[PDB]
Amino acid sequence: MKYVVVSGGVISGIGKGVLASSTGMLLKTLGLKVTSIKIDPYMNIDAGTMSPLEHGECFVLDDGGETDLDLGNYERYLGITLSRDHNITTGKIYSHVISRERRGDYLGKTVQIVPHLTNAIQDWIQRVSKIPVDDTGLEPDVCIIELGGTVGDIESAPFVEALRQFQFEVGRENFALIHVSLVPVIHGEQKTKPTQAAIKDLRSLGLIPDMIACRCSEELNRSTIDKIAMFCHVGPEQVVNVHDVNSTYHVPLLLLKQHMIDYLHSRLKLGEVPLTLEDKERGSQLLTNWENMTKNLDDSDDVVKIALVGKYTNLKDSYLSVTKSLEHASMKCRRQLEILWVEASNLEPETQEVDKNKFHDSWNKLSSADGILVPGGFGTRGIEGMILAAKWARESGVPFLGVCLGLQVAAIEFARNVIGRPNSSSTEFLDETLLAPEDQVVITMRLGLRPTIFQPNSEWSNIRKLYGEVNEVHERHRHRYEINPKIVNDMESRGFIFVGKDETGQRCEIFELKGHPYYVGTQYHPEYTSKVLEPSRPFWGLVAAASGTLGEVIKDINL
Amino acid sequence: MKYVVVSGGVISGIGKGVLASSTGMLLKTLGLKVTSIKIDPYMNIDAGTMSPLEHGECFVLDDGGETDLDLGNYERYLGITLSRDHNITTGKIYSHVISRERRGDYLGKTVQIVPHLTNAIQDWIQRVSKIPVDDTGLEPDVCIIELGGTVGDIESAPFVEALRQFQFEVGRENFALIHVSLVPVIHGEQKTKPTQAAIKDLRSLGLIPDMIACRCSEELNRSTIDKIAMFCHVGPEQVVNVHDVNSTYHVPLLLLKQHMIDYLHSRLKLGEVPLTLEDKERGSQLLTNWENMTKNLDDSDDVVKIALVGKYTNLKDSYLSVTKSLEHASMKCRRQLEILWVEASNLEPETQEVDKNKFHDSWNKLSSADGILVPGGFGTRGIEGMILAAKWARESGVPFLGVCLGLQVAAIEFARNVIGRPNSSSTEFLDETLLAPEDQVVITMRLGLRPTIFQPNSEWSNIRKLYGEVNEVHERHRHRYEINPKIVNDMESRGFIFVGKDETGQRCEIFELKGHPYYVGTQYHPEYTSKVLEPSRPFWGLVAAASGTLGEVIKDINL
Amino acid sequence: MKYVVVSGGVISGIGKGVLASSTGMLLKTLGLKVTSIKIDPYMNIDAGTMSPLEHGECFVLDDGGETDLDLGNYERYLGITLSRDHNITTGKIYSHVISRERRGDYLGKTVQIVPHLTNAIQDWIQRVSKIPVDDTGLEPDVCIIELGGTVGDIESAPFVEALRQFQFEVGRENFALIHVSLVPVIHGEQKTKPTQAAIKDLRSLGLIPDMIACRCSEELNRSTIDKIAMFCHVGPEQVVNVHDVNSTYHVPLLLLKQHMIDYLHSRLKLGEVPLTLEDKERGSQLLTNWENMTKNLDDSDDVVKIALVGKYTNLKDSYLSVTKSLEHASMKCRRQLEILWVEASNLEPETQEVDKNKFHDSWNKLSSADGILVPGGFGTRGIEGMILAAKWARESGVPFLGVCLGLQVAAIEFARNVIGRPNSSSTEFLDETLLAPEDQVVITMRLGLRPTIFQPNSEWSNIRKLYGEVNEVHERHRHRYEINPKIVNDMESRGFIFVGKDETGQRCEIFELKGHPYYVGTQYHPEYTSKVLEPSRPFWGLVAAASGTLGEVIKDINL
Ligand SMILES: Nc1ncnc2c1ncn2[C@@H]1O[C@H](COP(=O)(O)OP(=O)(O)OP(=O)(O)O)[C@@H](O)[C@H]1O
Ligand SMILES: Nc1ncnc2c1ncn2[C@@H]1O[C@H](COP(=O)(O)OP(=O)(O)OP(=O)(O)O)[C@@H](O)[C@H]1O
Ligand SMILES: Nc1ncnc2c1ncn2[C@@H]1O[C@H](COP(=O)(O)OP(=O)(O)OP(=O)(O)O)[C@@H](O)[C@H]1O
Ligand SMILES: O=c1ccn([C@H]2O[C@@H](COP(=O)(O)OP(=O)(O)OP(=O)(O)O)[C@@H](O)[C@H]2O)c(=O)[nH]1
Ligand SMILES: O=c1ccn([C@H]2O[C@@H](COP(=O)(O)OP(=O)(O)OP(=O)(O)O)[C@@H](O)[C@H]2O)c(=O)[nH]1
Ligand SMILES: O=c1ccn([C@H]2O[C@@H](COP(=O)(O)OP(=O)(O)OP(=O)(O)O)[C@@H](O)[C@H]2O)c(=O)[nH]1
Ligand SMILES: [Mg+2]
Ligand SMILES: [Mg+2]
Ligand SMILES: [Mg+2]
Ligand SMILES: [Mg+2]
Ligand SMILES: [Mg+2]
Ligand SMILES: [Mg+2]
């Protein structure tokens, strides 16, 4: 087992998550089996309790774990499945040793942060990195650890102490440290004192960096490389840079151009790892596929515009799996994507009195779009604006996908306007008044990977054709509210077909509307099962439908 | 409310606990109401799970809290009652904020060590210092906080960060810092660089010391004072020393000789605290009583020897409340005390084969003693040796006190040798063989302050006369095993009278033997209710009985 | 825009102001945006010139408008902000059309009460009801107009004529009339001829009532309802009653029990007003919060007593915002309130010669109280009595709040007795003698919403913790006199800390005294920013401090 810590810097926004995911995928090009662990200094047990306004969305695993967003970067670059154990936190590990001290496994000893908590962290990392995470039976060859927060924040102290010990409690040449660090530019001169201070803060904790990975708005000067490589122990080829490029898929090839594998191939002795003839082929094949999708982003120009309608769209981190799911679906179509970020509340007619500027801009953006997405996220702000987007998309025949809350919004819209029930509404917020036209109801969560069964007549639907006309689908759920199953037959008779349901019925999971080119919704989040070469099927439907060629996509999928 | 932090140094053994207790009692000489809080960086919720081989005994509060030993130093110097809340720990406060984050009181925010855990520590200190701790109704004027561990140990980090904030979240002139620090002597020269480094480690965390309290084997030189007072912000009178004197009761008067009150009277503005005419009298009266008991230790010479028989007596911290209870009882008698530390196992005849030196020395020490104590502490090592000490004390008519296990050992001894049941024994360790002559049985703990009722005939006993012939007694329990109540009438008929029991009966709490000058035992720990001017009654009995004058002590108590 | 006139009756004391405020809040439970306008037949431009001995206190708006007291009932029930335009008067509107006729906008026409003044009233009501009054950007859906004085008083004539026209100059189903009327009981029989005469006086002016709201000391008999509903056009459900209950917060639920919303929901066609899904939730949520605070007044019993010390306390209308601010603060604590009304002059030692009865009763009341308030109000009567209450509260350690004059009285008290300047005094009344120990000085008014900045060291204070430790506070001022800033450093050195000041300094706005559980004063009136669910912070401090639990209140506010 090899370990690669990706760590620290001078700021919390530095973009470690891209570099960790990219470093792991580059190791996967050698054919190595790879896994990864995110460490969070926060005291929350999970990202589930904490609101999307901080650290972006929670990400859902097959376990039903509501983990930190960074686990999604690993799953979609590395192709692996992660467990709720792969997101370590301060909350998890203090809860673990405190529950263990009350149970008494420490034999009446005094329990202390060193050695007992730092040995508990090292036991967690040793257990969790040996969980098999590919579909194959094998234990991973390499583990990427991403150390969240910044080095020398008091929040991090047990993890920087544990990782010092770990560099010896596992062999050297089985452990290596990448430090990620800020190189700000002032008056056009590339200033280095922030990264020199961060390299000292690592040495103060006994962590010694094997590569320094600069984050900068420029190519590093050869003087900027030398002034760091002379201050730190790293050689000139071990001062990595990652530029402020928009395409995060280019980062693996920007690291490969900087010869970063050729250092780790020595520094971790990756030639001593045994590999089969299948492994080297499936490794090199994966690199050629990534050269092709990045070539397609360099030379595809013909924009498809998708409008994304939701709360707090200024927090673009709040929708990162949607963004990445749309980008995978646009690459599969060989088309460039624009996302138009529509703050759903500004669509509402009260905005035309309160701030007439925001009203006209938000309705410009929505009218402009070749297809529409309603992305999910609980909370009562802007839902009539999201209902207005679903209405516009139904009436103007514009491709629509509704994910989680977006499906319920389309059901409420179709009830208010096509069934003509003018006060039909979500149970989430009006039930203090005990309303009879319930569109949502409660059914304390439904979470993680679940089976959807396609209902027997559904063979006609574009969405069931996108799932290869298979009878069942596996996707990740997260909801407490679902469509009222008393009203379902009214919608299924008026043409809004609930194409798929849970095994028990009375719990709707996919709809497609008869008489529209692509108007679809899902109760699950299709984003989380997206992979770079195999996009999320409902999103491959939406981004093909917006472009045209949805028939040719379905004809392809029938091979 | 005023706060006085006592803190840190270069080593964990430095003796903060004496200085905190002494500083608080000196503030009590002004008539101020005083309280105190111990902070422990360990992850244990309580000292109850952890074995006496580390940090000495657990101390029992009236709550039944098995707290850190340092709470006992506060109760016996300050005269206060502490709650299980007055011992803060890493385990307590991480358990508190983690349970609070799962309950969700933090409104979906990300929870972090700063500000959320440091604000939870500051809320704990603010709540707990306002608990009334004297017998009177009033809230305390001053709180002493003792910061356990050492400054810049990673274990301490949330508490040194919290206390920086606290210096502002409560006013300056309502908070002050005492730093306690090591001044080692090499070649007879008093070296200062360890304390200069500890003063820098405080400044690095933003904590600024108002007094530096040196711990040294000498009087500080005036150069040793100046070389510290020139390096640090403290004036010459704010460099305190506490010498390696044996009598810890002299420390309050050694601080008073160094004019330490006259600094805090300015630095905490203690003249602005309102005080009544009763308060100043009961304050100054308390100082004169302490001048008298310390004068008596300077001029009493006529030694009483008590042998203390138990496990691990090399760990003299394991019996600190016994030691202090014996010292209070010897001072009340105006007699000097020697304790003879007898490792109970060495009394056993197997020792005479294994190491004949340890056998003869341990039996020398036991034969030498004017009275005998068997102190408690669970675990099967040496119990036949403790039975042999109880036998010797019964047969030779030598004063005996058995506390907790020491009472059960005397019951087992009296059963084996006076009732003549040769295999009668503790249920604690032989019950894998299901023995019928059970002396102990289980009755998951009995803990904290409980009532003992004296059984109706008991008026004759020296122990009930020592409790003023009152019908009931309040003392602190800690046990899972008690005397088999089926066998009690056999002992009460053979003369081993169970003088006191729980309200329900079938649970024995005090015995006295008919036909011995003072042979007594208690199921409770009488040590924990000892106070400097009012010693523990069973121990005032033992140390009077060893000296003679037990009648005159009882005649006094009848006033 | 909908209008609801609340009007008239047989007497000026009838309690329209409660019914208007309650009717508006009930409309706010539907989620409608609401506003209100008070009409006063008096010739004063504002309530600022007129003394508190008539129509109670003046109320201060954010504008600095010294408006009629009834505007405060609207702000505290409806949650809205009012402008100096929302109090219409005879003085305002005759000043408006006379200044407009001298300017000549009437093009040389003869100007007459009809149509020109009645059209000016209708233009005022149309302009002012469309001012946005919530924190949100929206124009109000409903306006409550309260017609002051009584119908057919000659003082009212232009307003009853204007409102007849207004019923057509705005649509019917956009205007409705509530008439409030007296139903006296004689020999236990509920006499109706006063209200029959008041209903005729409305018809004589062409105003037709849509509901009759009886004010009576009983439940109306069903015969009393029928004998009114047969004489007037109103149906049986449109004869409202409001009982002489003490809790004015119960009136909204007594109107809701009488189904009064279900009439206005038809009669104003409030189902035709568009509402969003947020609006209906924030509407129904507000009703549940009001059910809870009224449930708490039904089942809280554990009295806190506050003594209110001031001039003319027999005029309990003179302190209505203080009373309501104390009631909001007691409800937030879940405790019942008694106010003890202490006429401040009777505390003075001259009273013990003049009327020894009034002396002993006033000092009984002040000694009895768990906390003390000095409420403001200019004029030289009783100020030494208010100084004696401030003295008593400082010395006996009893919670104290001084508002406006009450802060200056506490500064004068602390100067006379703790600084020991025996003749230090207000500049307001002794300056004919040109005294050097000035405690007040003049600094022609300071009025309306202003910023207070907390001075840098103030983090310790209970008052700054009650304001959430925010650096700035927004509250309503009204004063010509302030603390002499030459003497401020003497008080700040002796412990009376001026915790907050104006942006410029030299103008003190909050004090808290070091060394008292809660002794505070404000130059602003904290009463006017009180709201039913969010009490005034200095008053939430006082009423918590009197009860105990001031720490737990501050711990709560830190969430
Ligand atoms: N080299 C990079 N190139 C482009 N974008 C980057 C780069 N580094 C960081 N970012 C961007 O900055 C944001 C944060 O990056 P990332 O998640 O990898 O940082 P992080 O250190 O893991 O932050 P966090 O601790 O919050 O998870 C993301 O939007 C990411 O795409
Ligand atoms: N000034 C002193 N004079 C005499 N003995 C001292 C002094 N300082 C410390 N000691 C002794 O050293 C031991 C530890 O002292 P103390 O309990 O006060 O230290 P501490 O800092 O509180 O240690 P801990 O953190 O383990 O509780 C005790 O036996 C105590 O009596
Ligand atoms: N229904 C009621 N229940 C309880 N108290 C009432 C009621 N109606 C009036 N009052 C009380 O009578 C006094 C005057 O009431 P209110 O201010 O509402 O009358 P008003 O018609 O507006 O008088 P004004 O014209 O002087 O403003 C207040 O103390 C008020 O609390
Ligand atoms: O204003 C002054 C005065 C003096 N100095 C002095 O400090 C020295 C250290 O040089 P710098 O502080 O400029 O550091 P650096 O260029 O090595 O590092 P970067 O942060 O640019 O990566 C010398 O340059 C000396 O003149 C300054 O740097 N700045
Ligand atoms: O062996 C050597 C050589 C050089 N130095 C040098 O270091 C200097 C600092 O002096 P010290 O290191 O002796 O420190 P100090 O006496 O101030 O502190 P204490 O630890 O005794 O309290 C000077 O004395 C200089 O000669 C040594 O201290 N020791
Ligand atoms: O003393 C007399 C004599 C005659 N009347 C006469 O006047 C009549 C009108 O009856 P009332 O004047 O009693 O009026 P009312 O009962 O309808 O109204 P309230 O004021 O009680 O609501 C009849 O009752 C007739 O006898 C009196 O009312 N009172
Ligand atoms: Mg941040
Ligand atoms: Mg990240
Ligand atoms: Mg140790
Ligand atoms: Mg200690
Ligand atoms: Mg009047
Ligand atoms: Mg009124």
Which backbone phi and psi does C387 adopt, to 5 degrees? -60, -45
What's the CA-to-centroid distance between B15 and ligand 10, angstroms?
Answer: 6
Beta strands across the sheet bearing C519-522: C337-343, C304-310, C371-374, C400-403, C519-522, C508-513, C496-501, C446-454, C472-479
Distance of CA A433 to the CA centre of its chain: 38
Strand, helix or coil at C11?
coil
Q: What does the alpha-carbon distance between residue C4 and residue A430 come to, in Å, rounded to a whole number? A: 27
- Which of B105, B119, B169 comes nearest C459 by C-beta? B169
Quickly count: other Cβ atoms within 10 Å of residue B229's Cβ: 16
- Residue among B495, B528, B491 at smallest CA distance from B508: B491
The full set of domains in chain A, from first to last, is 2-290 (3.40.50.300), 295-558 (3.40.50.880)
Residue with tokens 């990864």: A36
Q: B212 - beta bridge partners?
A: B179, B239
Q: What does the alpha-carbon distance between residue A524 and residue C238 come to, in Å, rounded to a whole number? A: 52
Strand, helix or coil at B299?
helix
C508 in active site: no
Quickly count: other Cβ atoms within 10 Å of residue B410's Cβ: 27
C459 CB neighbours in chain B (<8 A) are 168-169, 171
Give the CA count within 13 Å in the CB-facing half-sphere of B118: 20
Tokens found for residue A91 = 């909350």
- Helices A405-414 and A383-395 cross at an angle (nearest 10°) of 60
> Are the Cβ atoms of C460 and B119 closer than 8 angstroms?
no
Nearest protein Cα to ligand 4, atom 12: A193
Integer CA distances (angstroms), B254 to A291, B217, B225, B244, in order: 80, 14, 16, 11
Contacts of A443 (CB under 8 A, 6+ apart): A480, A481, A482, A506, A507
List active site positions of B: 404, 525, 527
Integer CA distances (angstroms), A287 to A20, A129, A248, A252, A284, in order: 17, 24, 16, 10, 5
Sign of the alpha-carbon torsion through C154, C158, C161, C164: negative
Across C399-537, the runs of DSSP E, i.e. the strands, are 400-403, 440-442, 446-454, 472-479, 481-483, 496-501, 508-513, 519-522
Strand, helix or coil at A179?
strand
Contacts of C174 (CB under 8 A, 6+ apart): C1, C2, C3, C268
Q: Considering only residues 78 to 97 of chain A, which have any Cβ-Cβ distance to chain B shorter than 8 Å?
A: 90-91, 94-95, 97
**DSSP codes of every residue in C147-182:** E-S-TT-GGGHHHHHHHHHHHHHS-TTSEEEEEEEE
Torsion of CA B409, B411, B417, B422, to 10 degrees: -80
Q: Which amino acid appears at position A419 of this protein?
A: I
Q: Which amino acid appears at position A23 of this protein?
A: T
How, if at all, do strands C66-67 and C189-190 pair?
unpaired
Distance of CA A529 to the CA centre of its chain: 10
Q: Considering only residues 492 to 521 of chain A, which have any Cβ-Cβ distance to chain C shorter than 8 Å?
A: none
Across C9-58, the runs of DSSP E, i.e. the strands, are 34-40
Tokens found for residue B187 = 């070649």
Sign of the alpha-carbon torsion through C91, C94, C100, C104: negative
Integer CA distances (angstroms), A144 to A85, A336, A505, B547, in order: 14, 31, 41, 73
Tokens found for residue A452 = 């959807």
- Does residue A375 have a cis bond before it (omega within 30 degrees)? no
- Residue among A556, A5, A57 at smallest CA distance from A319: A57
- Which of C137, C138, C277 comes nearest A384 by C-beta? C277
Interface B:C, Cβ pairs < 8 A: 28
What's the CA-to-centroid distance between A10 and ligand 8, angstroms?
Answer: 14
Strand, helix or coil at A511?
strand
Tokens found for residue A464 = 């069931």
**Active-site option among C404, C475, C482, C516:** C404
The CA-CA-CA angle for residues A234, A235, A240, to 5°, reads: 75
Please indicate if any CB of chain A lies within 8 Å of the CB of C229.
no
- Asked if C527 contacts C542 with a C-beta cutoff of 8 angstroms, the reply is no
- Asked if B37 contacts B24 with a C-beta cutoff of 8 angstroms, the reply is no
Q: What does the alpha-carbon distance between residue A264 and residue A23 come to, in Å, rounded to a whole number? A: 10
**Chain interruptions in chain A, by residue before each (C–N > 2.5 Å):** 443
**Active-site option among A55, A328, A477, A525:** A525
Q: What does the alpha-carbon distance between residue B121 and residue B165 come to, in Å, rounded to a whole number? A: 10
Q: Where are the alpha helices (DSSP H) in A238-369?
A: 251-257, 260-267, 277-299, 320-332, 351-354, 356-368
Q: Where are the alpha helices (DSSP H) in B210-276?
A: 222-229, 251-257, 260-267
Contacts of C262 (CB under 8 A, 6+ apart): C237
As to burial, measured by CB atoms within 10 angstroms (0-12 exposed, 13-18 middle, 19+ buried), residue B388 is buried
Indicate the DSSP class of residue A116. Answer: I
Sign of the alpha-carbon torsion through B485, B487, B490, B491: negative
Q: What does the alpha-carbon distance between residue C374 and residue C409 come to, in Å, rounded to a whole number? A: 8
Diameter of chain C by CA atoms? Answer: 74
Strand, helix or coil at C66?
strand
Contacts of C539 (CB under 8 A, 6+ apart): C325, C326, C328, C329, C401, C526, C527, C530
C527 in active site: yes
Resolution for this PDB entry, in angstroms: 3.3
Sign of the alpha-carbon torsion through A415, A419, A424, A427: negative
Q: What does the alpha-carbon distance between residue A218 and residue A153 come to, in Å, rounded to a whole number? A: 28
Tokens found for residue C88 = 């219409």
- Residue among B296, B321, B310 at smallest CA distance from B526: B321
Distance of CA A182 to the CA centre of its chain: 24
Reading phi first (left if > 0) and then psi (alpha if -120 to 50, else beta), residue C334 is in left
For chain C, helix, strand, coil in percent to 5 are: 45, 20, 35
Contacts of A465 (CB under 8 A, 6+ apart): A554, A557, A558
Indicate the DSSP class of residue B372. Answer: E
- Asked if A107 contacts A97 with a C-beta cutoff of 8 angstroms, the reply is no
Integer CA distances (angstroms), A33 to A80, A81, A131, A198, B50, in order: 9, 12, 12, 32, 44
C460 CB neighbours in chain B (<8 A) are 168-171, 174
As to burial, measured by CB atoms within 10 angstroms (0-12 exposed, 13-18 middle, 19+ buried), residue C433 is exposed
Rg of chain B (C-alpha set)? 25
Q: What does the alpha-carbon distance between residue B43 and residue C255 come to, in Å, rounded to a whole number? A: 59
- Asked if B20 contacts B74 with a C-beta cutoff of 8 angstroms, the reply is yes
Q: Where are the alpha helices (DSSP H) in B109-190?
A: 118-129, 157-169
Quickly count: other Cβ atoms within 10 Å of residue A196's Cβ: 15
What's the CA-to-centroid distance between A18 and ligand 8, angstroms?
Answer: 8
- Residue among C204, C57, C85 at smallest CA distance from C143: C85
B101 CB neighbours in chain A (<8 A) are 43-45, 49, 91
Contacts of B324 (CB under 8 A, 6+ apart): B72, B76, B527, B530
Q: Where are the alpha helices (DSSP H) in C435-510?
A: 462-466, 488-494
Please indicate if any CB of chain B lies within 8 Å of the CB of A101.
yes
As to burial, measured by CB atoms within 10 angstroms (0-12 exposed, 13-18 middle, 19+ buried), residue B437 is middle
Indicate the DSSP class of residue B69. Answer: T
Tokens found for residue A441 = 């109801």
Distance of CA C377 to the CA centre of its chain: 15
Quickly count: other Cβ atoms within 10 Å of residue A20's Cβ: 28
- Asked if B142 contacts A84 with a C-beta cutoff of 8 angstroms, the reply is no
Q: How close does chain B come to C394, measured CA to CA in Å?
A: 12
Go through chain A and tell me how many residues it has: 559
Quickly count: other Cβ atoms within 10 Å of residue C364's Cβ: 11
Which backbone phi and psi does A483 adopt, to 5 degrees? -60, 135
What's the CA-to-centroid distance between A90 and ligand 1, angstroms?
Answer: 21
Q: What does the alpha-carbon distance between residue A362 and residue A390 come to, in Å, rounded to a whole number? A: 14
- Asked if A64 contacts A55 with a C-beta cutoff of 8 angstroms, the reply is no
> Are the Cβ atoms of B117 and A55 closer than 8 angstroms?
no
Integer CA distances (angstroms), A409 to A81, A375, A439, C204, C282, in order: 31, 11, 9, 55, 20
Q: What does the alpha-carbon distance between residue B458 and residue B469 come to, in Å, rounded to a whole number? A: 9
Q: Which amino acid appears at position C145 of this protein?
A: I
User: With b meaning 16 or more CB within 10 Å and e meaning fewer, what string describes C209-243?
Assistant: bbbbbbbbeeebeeebbebbbeebebeeebbbbbe
Q: C142 - beta bridge partners?
A: C2, C34
Diameter of chain B by CA atoms? Answer: 74
Q: What does the alpha-carbon distance between residue B34 and residue B25 come to, in Å, rounded to a whole number? A: 8
- Residue among C66, C69, C71 at smallest CA distance from C86: C71
Contacts of C172 (CB under 8 A, 6+ apart): none
- Asked if B405 contacts B433 with a C-beta cutoff of 8 angstroms, the reply is no
Ligand 4 residue neighbourhood (C-beta within 6 Å):
A 191-193
Give the CA count within 13 Å in the CB-facing half-sphere of B181: 28
Tokens found for residue C287 = 């009703």
- Asked if B416 contacts B422 with a C-beta cutoff of 8 angstroms, the reply is yes
Distance between start and end Cα atoms, chain A: 39
Which chains reach chain A with 3 or more Cβ–Cβ distances below 8 angstroms? B, C
Q: What does the alpha-carbon distance between residue A231 and residue A179 come to, in Å, rounded to a whole number? A: 14
How, if at all, do strands C304-310 and C337-343 pair?
parallel
C328 in active site: no
Q: Considering only residues 161 to 200 of chain B, which have any Cβ-Cβ distance to chain A shorter than 8 Å?
A: 161
- Asked if A320 contacts A523 with a C-beta cutoff of 8 angstroms, the reply is no
Which chains reach chain B with 3 or more Cβ–Cβ distances below 8 angstroms? A, C
- Residue among A211, A153, A218, A151 at smallest CA distance from A184: A218
> Are the Cβ atoms of A49 and B114 closer than 8 angstroms?
no
Q: What does the alpha-carbon distance between residue A220 and residue A191 come to, in Å, rounded to a whole number? A: 10
Q: What does the alpha-carbon distance between residue C332 and residue C544 come to, in Å, rounded to a whole number? A: 9
Q: A144 - beta bridge partners?
A: A4, A36
Q: Where are the alpha helices (DSSP H) in B396-503?
A: 405-414, 427-430, 462-466, 488-494
| Ligand 2 touching residue B9 (CB < 6 A) | no
Q: How close does chain B come to A9, measured CA to CA in Å?
A: 19
- Does residue A115 have a cis bond before it (omega within 30 degrees)? yes
Distance of CA B485 to the CA centre of its chain: 31
Q: What does the alpha-carbon distance between residue B264 and residue A339 come to, in Å, rounded to a whole number? A: 66
Q: Which amino acid appears at position A202 of this protein?
A: L
- Which of C137, C277, C284 comes nearest A353 by C-beta? C137
What's the CA-to-centroid distance between C197 and ligand 6, angstroms?
Answer: 14
**DSSP codes of every residue in C368-402:** H-SEEEE----SSTTHHHHHHHHHHHHHTT--EEE
Which backbone phi and psi does C436 adopt, to 5 degrees? -70, -35
| Ligand 5 touching residue B446 (CB < 6 A) | no
Distance between start and end Cα atoms, chain C: 39
The CA-CA-CA angle for residues C34, C39, C42, to 5°, reads: 160
Tokens found for residue C364 = 């009984």
Tokens found for residue B33 = 């109401």
How, if at all, do strands C211-216 and C175-182 pair?
parallel
Residue with tokens 């070469």: A533
- Does residue B115 have a cis bond before it (omega within 30 degrees)? yes
Tokens found for residue C13 = 């004391």
> Are the Cβ atoms of C281 and A430 closer than 8 angstroms?
yes
Quickly count: other Cβ atoms within 10 Å of residue B243's Cβ: 14
Q: What does the alpha-carbon distance between residue A387 and residue B198 come to, in Å, rounded to a whole number? A: 64
> Are the Cβ atoms of C515 and B126 closer than 8 angstroms?
no
Of all ligands present, the nearest one to the C-alpha of B324 is 2
- Asked if C83 contacts C65 with a C-beta cutoff of 8 angstroms, the reply is yes
Quickly count: other Cβ atoms within 10 Å of residue A295's Cβ: 10
How, if at all, do strands A185-186 and A175-182 pair?
unpaired
> Are the Cβ atoms of B116 and A43 closer than 8 angstroms?
yes
- Helices A356-368 and A383-395 cross at an angle (nearest 10°) of 40
